[PDB]
Design an enzyme around this catalytic site. Structure first.
Site, PDB file in Angstrom:
ATOM      1  N   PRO A  57      44.355 -61.511 -17.653  1.00  0.00           N
ATOM      2  CA  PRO A  57      45.221 -62.271 -18.522  1.00  0.00           C
ATOM      3  C   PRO A  57      45.443 -63.727 -18.144  1.00  0.00           C
ATOM      4  O   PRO A  57      45.401 -64.088 -16.973  1.00  0.00           O
ATOM      5  CB  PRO A  57      46.531 -61.550 -18.475  1.00  0.00           C
ATOM      6  CG  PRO A  57      46.185 -60.155 -17.948  1.00  0.00           C
ATOM      7  CD  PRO A  57      45.026 -60.311 -17.064  1.00  0.00           C
ATOM      8  N   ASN A  58      45.582 -64.543 -19.187  1.00  0.00           N
ATOM      9  CA  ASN A  58      45.908 -65.959 -19.077  1.00  0.00           C
ATOM     10  C   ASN A  58      44.767 -66.854 -18.622  1.00  0.00           C
ATOM     11  O   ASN A  58      44.867 -68.043 -18.738  1.00  0.00           O
ATOM     12  CB  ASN A  58      47.156 -66.206 -18.213  1.00  0.00           C
ATOM     13  CG  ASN A  58      48.356 -65.481 -18.764  1.00  0.00           C
ATOM     14  OD1 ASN A  58      48.768 -65.722 -19.874  1.00  0.00           O
ATOM     15  ND2 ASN A  58      48.911 -64.568 -17.977  1.00  0.00           N
TER      16      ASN A  58
ATOM     17  N   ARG B 294      45.516 -76.902 -21.369  1.00  0.00           N
ATOM     18  CA  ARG B 294      46.735 -77.706 -21.335  1.00  0.00           C
ATOM     19  C   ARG B 294      46.555 -78.975 -20.529  1.00  0.00           C
ATOM     20  O   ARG B 294      46.457 -78.933 -19.295  1.00  0.00           O
ATOM     21  CB  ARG B 294      47.966 -76.964 -20.813  1.00  0.00           C
ATOM     22  CG  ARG B 294      49.217 -77.532 -21.442  1.00  0.00           C
ATOM     23  CD  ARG B 294      50.512 -76.986 -20.891  1.00  0.00           C
ATOM     24  NE  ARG B 294      50.454 -76.436 -19.531  1.00  0.00           N
ATOM     25  CZ  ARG B 294      50.930 -76.999 -18.416  1.00  0.00           C
ATOM     26  NH1 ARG B 294      51.488 -78.209 -18.410  1.00  0.00           N
ATOM     27  NH2 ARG B 294      50.836 -76.336 -17.271  1.00  0.00           N
TER      28      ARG B 294
ATOM     29  N   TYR C  32      45.794 -79.411 -14.735  1.00  0.00           N
ATOM     30  CA  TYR C  32      45.052 -78.427 -13.904  1.00  0.00           C
ATOM     31  C   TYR C  32      43.504 -78.515 -14.025  1.00  0.00           C
ATOM     32  O   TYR C  32      42.787 -77.673 -13.485  1.00  0.00           O
ATOM     33  CB  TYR C  32      45.594 -77.012 -14.197  1.00  0.00           C
ATOM     34  CG  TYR C  32      46.844 -76.731 -13.400  1.00  0.00           C
ATOM     35  CD1 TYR C  32      46.782 -76.689 -12.005  1.00  0.00           C
ATOM     36  CD2 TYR C  32      48.106 -76.618 -14.025  1.00  0.00           C
ATOM     37  CE1 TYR C  32      47.928 -76.505 -11.251  1.00  0.00           C
ATOM     38  CE2 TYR C  32      49.251 -76.429 -13.284  1.00  0.00           C
ATOM     39  CZ  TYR C  32      49.161 -76.371 -11.909  1.00  0.00           C
ATOM     40  OH  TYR C  32      50.319 -76.181 -11.211  1.00  0.00           O
TER      41      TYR C  32
ATOM     42  N   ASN D 203      38.330 -61.119 -11.605  1.00  0.00           N
ATOM     43  CA  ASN D 203      39.547 -61.908 -11.409  1.00  0.00           C
ATOM     44  C   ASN D 203      40.634 -61.299 -12.254  1.00  0.00           C
ATOM     45  O   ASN D 203      40.792 -61.593 -13.399  1.00  0.00           O
ATOM     46  CB  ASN D 203      39.344 -63.377 -11.763  1.00  0.00           C
ATOM     47  CG  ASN D 203      40.581 -64.190 -11.479  1.00  0.00           C
ATOM     48  OD1 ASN D 203      41.620 -63.659 -11.195  1.00  0.00           O
ATOM     49  ND2 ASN D 203      40.445 -65.497 -11.527  1.00  0.00           N
TER      50      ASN D 203
ATOM     51  N   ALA E 151      47.090 -62.014 -12.896  1.00  0.00           N
ATOM     52  CA  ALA E 151      48.416 -61.430 -12.597  1.00  0.00           C
ATOM     53  C   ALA E 151      48.391 -59.906 -12.338  1.00  0.00           C
ATOM     54  O   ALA E 151      49.249 -59.380 -11.645  1.00  0.00           O
ATOM     55  CB  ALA E 151      49.394 -61.718 -13.705  1.00  0.00           C
TER      56      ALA E 151
ATOM     57  N   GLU F 192      36.697 -59.151  -5.645  1.00  0.00           N
ATOM     58  CA  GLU F 192      37.869 -59.768  -6.249  1.00  0.00           C
ATOM     59  C   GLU F 192      37.859 -61.259  -6.032  1.00  0.00           C
ATOM     60  O   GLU F 192      37.613 -61.742  -4.927  1.00  0.00           O
ATOM     61  CB  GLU F 192      39.118 -59.128  -5.680  1.00  0.00           C
ATOM     62  CG  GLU F 192      40.396 -59.696  -6.280  1.00  0.00           C
ATOM     63  CD  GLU F 192      41.718 -59.064  -5.719  1.00  0.00           C
ATOM     64  OE1 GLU F 192      41.715 -58.115  -4.908  1.00  0.00           O
ATOM     65  OE2 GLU F 192      42.774 -59.509  -6.188  1.00  0.00           O
TER      66      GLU F 192
ATOM     67  N   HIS G 163      39.809 -65.027  -7.049  1.00  0.00           N
ATOM     68  CA  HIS G 163      40.888 -65.912  -7.566  1.00  0.00           C
ATOM     69  C   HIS G 163      40.507 -67.380  -7.437  1.00  0.00           C
ATOM     70  O   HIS G 163      40.050 -67.792  -6.393  1.00  0.00           O
ATOM     71  CB  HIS G 163      42.206 -65.682  -6.877  1.00  0.00           C
ATOM     72  CG  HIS G 163      42.675 -64.263  -7.029  1.00  0.00           C
ATOM     73  ND1 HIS G 163      43.310 -63.815  -8.187  1.00  0.00           N
ATOM     74  CD2 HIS G 163      42.560 -63.185  -6.199  1.00  0.00           C
ATOM     75  CE1 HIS G 163      43.511 -62.521  -8.079  1.00  0.00           C
ATOM     76  NE2 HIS G 163      43.030 -62.108  -6.906  1.00  0.00           N
TER      77      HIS G 163
ATOM     78  N   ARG H  15      51.216 -69.382  -2.650  1.00  0.00           N
ATOM     79  CA  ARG H  15      52.193 -69.324  -3.727  1.00  0.00           C
ATOM     80  C   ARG H  15      53.307 -68.374  -3.368  1.00  0.00           C
ATOM     81  O   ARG H  15      53.502 -68.073  -2.200  1.00  0.00           O
ATOM     82  CB  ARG H  15      51.402 -68.888  -5.007  1.00  0.00           C
ATOM     83  CG  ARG H  15      50.269 -69.896  -5.232  1.00  0.00           C
ATOM     84  CD  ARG H  15      49.386 -69.586  -6.354  1.00  0.00           C
ATOM     85  NE  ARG H  15      50.116 -69.792  -7.579  1.00  0.00           N
ATOM     86  CZ  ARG H  15      49.681 -69.442  -8.761  1.00  0.00           C
ATOM     87  NH1 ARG H  15      48.493 -68.895  -8.896  1.00  0.00           N
ATOM     88  NH2 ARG H  15      50.470 -69.616  -9.790  1.00  0.00           N
TER      89      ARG H  15
END
Lengths: 145, 145, 145, 145, 145, 147, 145, 145, 145, 145, 145, 145
Positions: free
Chosen positions: F11-12, F19, F24, F76, F79, F100, F102, F109
């Protein structure tokens, strides 16, 4: 029908330090707004601020003898620390709404815990001075439907 | 100027089970009250409810492309579990206010944690349907001062 | 439509992924056995599987409209993560029994926690497919003593 | 082929106190129903109850010398406290199914932990006395397929 | 009479199950070896084993009346659970050495905690039966330097 | 279809580069996929790609991978790494090994981002190396599948 | 060297600070006893002490090349802090016994935790210098059994 | 018969070791004082002590059949460990007062947790033998106001 | 000189024990591969391994004076224990990538915590020796336009 | 003057709200009973109540200058929060007994922790107003024979 | 040497990186200031810095043999990790004062724990280089009153 | 007042009187010393002590209006409990140094936590009355370089 608004420690400082830092709004400004709002509904409203936990506890006990029907309380730092306050509110059995100007969840982890929240009717945080005005609106509706 | 109201899972059940148990108020009633409030201020307001986390995330992405300026979100159970939702709101960078009908602090300990509250403007809980109106009132003031 | 059996995510893989590991038994086999058992008692039984939490929540809401009297649910991984599920079951107020094929207590520590178990009538884990039959037997006895 | 059913402390009280709130069912009634079920399958079944942990541990040791093939155990309060019981069952290497009448996940937090459940074939809780029968049915299938 | 060796629950199983599994050594073998070792040094040595915590506690009280100078104790599972045993040793004020055949630190995390170890003179674990012999050698040296 | 490697984005991640591409960066999900597809073609390995905001879809896609003979998954989960047991059970249930990935350093974070329901079952993990992390995963996978 | 004895940091101070705290016994005394004991069994025994963790790690690596068959280690303070040491012992795969002079369970809580104990054959604590001899005795029996 | 005084493990040691230094007062002295106190009020009082948890649980069961109205219990170490006891007292539903001679809060942190205190009418700790008399005085007043 | 590769304790053992079990690859092999890869891009690459934390810290300080632009570090066990290392890297302000051969998340829980990872550009774990190459590839890209 | 009784915040509410809710007994009633009890023994007794922590601390400092020999304190909510109070009592070194009307172990988990109990001679909770009398009885015995 | 000043790892970096970033002050500047201050009081002062823990432990041992009467130590990162350092200081029994340039409480949570602070005479943090002078002043006064 | 020294609860007890001290130093002695030190530097210094938290908070507010530039505060017990104090100091934005006479890390674990330290310039503990003087010295340097 009487409503009591209680402001906890340090809230007296609002608008005092560099009104460009945290804004121009004062505790007195907030109280004036609330008093006017309550007058518009024909509700008597009292207000109280102190830096001293005992004064606040005594003020709650006095509310019981005055027939106060609902308390709107911004306990400020006492929220995280004062079981005496919780026991005062529960001991007089006056329902209350908890209000904070700032979003406490956005700050240090110790600010996430409250000795009051779970006994409140509800909680408003992070909406500034309007939070008090909302609480008051809710209270008016509840006291005079 | 557009405001989006998002309701999370199970909120469609409001008023459906034994309207003597948890009351008569429905999700549709809440939405009608908010739409009327927004119309009074000449603000366009959309609403969305889903039981599916993906749908909610997709709806938030769509909000970005629609120029939504503020989200009022009752994530219901997702407040405790959904990092995806947090990342959706932060990813589109639309400010939000978190709302709950009930007082989550008065319930089980797992309901005390939120993946959204720290990033919200603010939070209202426990004030019933009026919480959404208060949020909307704040949002109106903020968008059109 | 009397008793509803719900299977959570990944349970559609039973018997697919090497008869080596967890054997030859399939989700369809389990459903057939249960349907036959319910038919023997003249009870109507529906069955449902999905990988999607929202689909399961929707199914639960539907159950309330269909007059389902008891839910037998193997939430699989959702037992550890889904508050939405808990809130759906509680929101429709249908009693349920929780079932797991495997002994969850014998696995990783995160599997020891459930958002459902404390609200279930009871829980059966580690007895394989028979755990669903036992649950059904209990449910039949309860509905038609 | 032998099955041993072990009942832990306080279970002798079943049905004794005010049978019209905690129910009528006795420990002896449970034993009767299990014996009958076993006799129907031509399986020898023994039963044992004690309030002393040492007696239970001794009983388990005796089970090893008797050729008991499976133990059905309701450790009651011992499930949360007795490592000795765990070590007895592992030491004799007789497989076991753990049973509770009540849903232990619905009670105080300290009741959520067990020194047995991770080593059990499986666990049944909250299904009343039928949980023992289910355990027994599984055990019969397993011993005589 | 001068030295008392106490063995806790389940140790009576040593060497009983498939003497190829965990070895041929019995509790009785260990006791014979320790008795001979004590005799060599003209020290009277007693031994005790039980599966019942009360019997152990009683034995410890009896040791006080017998003038026992030191206890060598393998509490087995009771090390993790018995405060009564801790209080029996402290209450009679006889110094003790704790012994385990197996390396308890290599097992489940609950086995890492002892209600005795902190009050022992010392602890020997994982060295098999020789651990008792070492304890006895230390104890002899201490009592007769 | 058959795809030897499947790349899954949680997601996302569809928001990448959307944006204020000065905030980013300019890189998009599509850019990442195109790079990986070109890399795989260069090795004569078939690669498929999938993104969704819905956990059920991802689970369904993993099940579909089994039936397509996928040999390795590069994922990936975004969340969902912190929340989804279902995803863990899907990967374990189909027994397809995975890596995995990221884009950002999750360890830099919030503390809740430090926990994963996947990492312990992965072959390995790459975090914080931006889009190159996927390429490295892919390179590792290619080596492993064709030595 | 068939057996290697490693002493960790600060153990060089034994017997130096006052005739009384840990008494008159010195590290050199301990090493001389052990060497004599090993000679009596025709076993080659080396010793090493350092305050520097790297020097100990290096010494363990060197042990692998020398054919050392067992290590007796008093890691002193490193037991509670050094993963590197753990990985050195596991990396060379030489079995070891952990020894402490003093009873570490009787001291501060941070001394209860070891990065070694769970991978040691066993552990001896609180028996003073003899603990090293016991370990040596065990090791001798295990190597020339 | 009307009131039962239960003493837990190790309390039989009172006054046995070096009375001039560790206390003269004996368990028998305590019982004799209570018996006299109860006789003065025309209440029948029984006493019981055991080191065996099962004996205590049996005793509590026997109390129910004797019509005991209130239990005064010093569970000693069992207060920290025994769920069985808690379940025995709750199972017979006889109200109890928990007593300790010493102040348990002044000792080790594990002694700060009780499986009984939360279900007791109340608790007295640290007042020596008078704590029992006070409990008895309360009990007399409650049974015969 | 432009890129520095640091290996922590025990990595010198790679390929040394029973090469069949942990494989044939040596630390020297790894260093050769990386040197060749860097030569191909015309980058100067230095390498360093030590079992001594102080040596590593000293090495990092030296890197600052040599103009090192990026560190690729496999701190091995030190990742879990060394604040000194974190403070060295931060103090010289040289960006770094953290590399592990094995998947640390698949191992004991204490290996899940790092004093470095949060300050690294990124982390690669579980990809064997190729992890160092990837890190090097990334670094080359970053350093050269 | 010889004994001081201190009551903490909110205890002034006793008997005030709906004397059918939590009973008719008032703080003054308690004080009267204690004064009479002390007079019977020819002991001077003072009493003090306050909602303000600072008043209580000042009162304790005053006690030192008045030669108070023992304090009987019900700190109410302050028991869970006030390190100042602990430090006052320890600083003047007047021994104290802690009393609570209600059983604090039967309430919320935060009420289980005390900054006083570990330094008290003892504690009495849950025995209502008689708890103060018992404390006084103990105190008299201790000051007099 | 009457007074020894010890600086831990990375403190050699002070003033080296962009003396506009964290300032111009160097380790040498500090040592010069302290040496001058001690000379003014006729006290001999030694200094030491290392990145290696072992060196620091060796230096503390050497201090004992030199008659050092007090140590002023800035352990830097070792304050959070080194039990060996604690045991060195306790082992030689030289009193010490712990100093930090920066306020460690203001940084990451892992920096809030120290293996030395609880055995120090006292601690100074956050006062920059002057903290060492203040410690030295205190030490001078204590050695020569 | 340029510099304000604040002393928290119970510090009035210092010295003769004794909080249990072998020591004659009083709070007044400390204040005298500090006043003389400040006068030597031509700095105006005020002092304040109170057992009432509200008084302290008020005093900090007053400091803002008096142009106080730096606060030296020994909050005593309030350091562990008072968020109000933290919020007062941050709300007026006067920098502060936290001082304790005793080494708080050497005492009970609850004394290891501060609501102030992380916002202080720095902290001095365990150096007795000189700690205040050091703080004052620092402050003077900072205000008049």
């Amino acid at each position: 029908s009487t409503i009591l608004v209680i402001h906890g420690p340090n809230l007296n400082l609002l608008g005092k330090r560099e009104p460009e830092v945290y804004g121009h709004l004062t505790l007195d400004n907030i109280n004036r707004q609330l008093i006017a709002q309550a007058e518009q509904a024909s509700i008597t409203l009292d207000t109280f601020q102190s830096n001293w936990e005992g004064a606040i506890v005594d003020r709650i006990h006095q509310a019981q003898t005055e027939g106060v029907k609902l308390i709107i309380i911004n306990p400020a730092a006492l929220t995280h620390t004062s079981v005496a306050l919780r026991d005062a509110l529960l001991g007089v059995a006056i329902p209350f709404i908890e209000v904070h100007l700032s979003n406490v969840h956005a700050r240090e982890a110790f600010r996430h815990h409250s000795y009051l929240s779970d006994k409140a009717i509800g909680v408003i945080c992070g909406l500034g001075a309007k939070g008090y005005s909302f609480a008051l609106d809710y209270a008016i509706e509840k006291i005079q439907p």
